[PDB]
Design a protein around this ligand. Sequence first.
Ligand code: HEM
Ligand code: HEM
Lengths: 182, 182
Amino acid sequence: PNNRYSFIGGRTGQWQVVKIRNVLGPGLQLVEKVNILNGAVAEIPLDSAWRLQGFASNIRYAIRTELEALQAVVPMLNRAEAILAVLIPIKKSAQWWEMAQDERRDIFERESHHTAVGLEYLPGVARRLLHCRDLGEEFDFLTWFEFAPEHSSAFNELLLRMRASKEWEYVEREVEVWLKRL
Amino acid sequence: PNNRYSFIGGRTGQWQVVKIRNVLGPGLQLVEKVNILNGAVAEIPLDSAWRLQGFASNIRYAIRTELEALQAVVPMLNRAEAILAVLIPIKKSAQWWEMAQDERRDIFERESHHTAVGLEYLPGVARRLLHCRDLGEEFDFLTWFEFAPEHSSAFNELLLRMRASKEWEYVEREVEVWLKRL
Ligand code: HEM
Ligand code: HEM
């Protein structure tokens, strides 16, 4: 299997763009669809507005008991019912990346309860975390969420709780690409 | 700045290959020299035998007090006297990468005291850690050490201690490329 994923905003793809919300910092040009490829894409179709990419990686913060709680409720991607998705690219500040591992873990979970909060929205919400700072990309992470319409309200609630977190004080660019499965 | 480094084994470079010691698992072909480039190289050069690459990244394990101690004593790269170097590509097992963050930190420092042991030798040894599992490379890490002859015996003692640690029970491929500055 290949750990690289590419998200190309343009006129083709498996996902229709519903809405792009430019939450913080420079946004992303509106496009019609998102095409998702499991691999690297050196050059995009010239009818494409942007390309984002990241890799699936190892665990950086979650501890064993947290992983065991997640595994108990985590849903799979590509559920038939999960016709809504959101792609949320995120960039954190240089101050964050300069911090040591204990400092970042303390903000992520002991102060912000990132995993404990997210667990409350499983199994409704399926997700994929990709990393891209080490690729030299403009964002540091591509986060992906998908779910049935019955969980839209809960997901909006989750977003409000996260954006109010200490961890968010270090986010410096964020965009939401709302999607509907074709 | 560019976070990517390539190490090309072949007939050109800043470092002469003294010997290659294929410590564990498949080795690396003997070559005359190692060429180090602060950038990606798309393909292995025609007459070169291999191309290793990795990126400099954020801290994964060290805590603030450890980083303070390290940053206070580590020497700069390219000291006049640091005419010896060793490039040690390392691969860890799938069992390692499936462990959680607390499980890996506990092996890396609580059990093995990797940083505390390294610190004993670090005043005279300049180091660079690079990551490459996430690039799809055959190794997980490229580690780089350079020092004066005066520190050769001490560096071998460090290697003796590290290969006996709990951490290295998870190393599954390792090569030593011993070098001398041209
Ligand atoms: C839906 C429930 C969620 C759960 C269960 C959850 C869980 C997790 C876990 C366990 C990690 C740590 C992975 C590791 O240790 O490497 C993580 C990372 C991350 N999550 Fe969430 N998450 C959820 C929702 C969200 C949302 C809604 C966002 C964005 C608004 C988000 C953004 C991120 C980011 C940016 C990271 C990377 C943090 C870093 O490495 O600095 N998560 N998530
Ligand atoms: C010379 C003194 C040394 C010091 C001060 C030292 C220090 C460190 C530190 C602080 C890290 C963790 C960086 C982080 O938190 O991400 C690290 C990682 C690593 N070091 Fe060393 N080290 C030394 C020698 C060595 C040697 C001789 C080897 C190889 C034989 C080695 C192989 C590694 C590897 C493979 C990693 C990555 C571990 C992982 O992420 O699983 N180190 N080192």
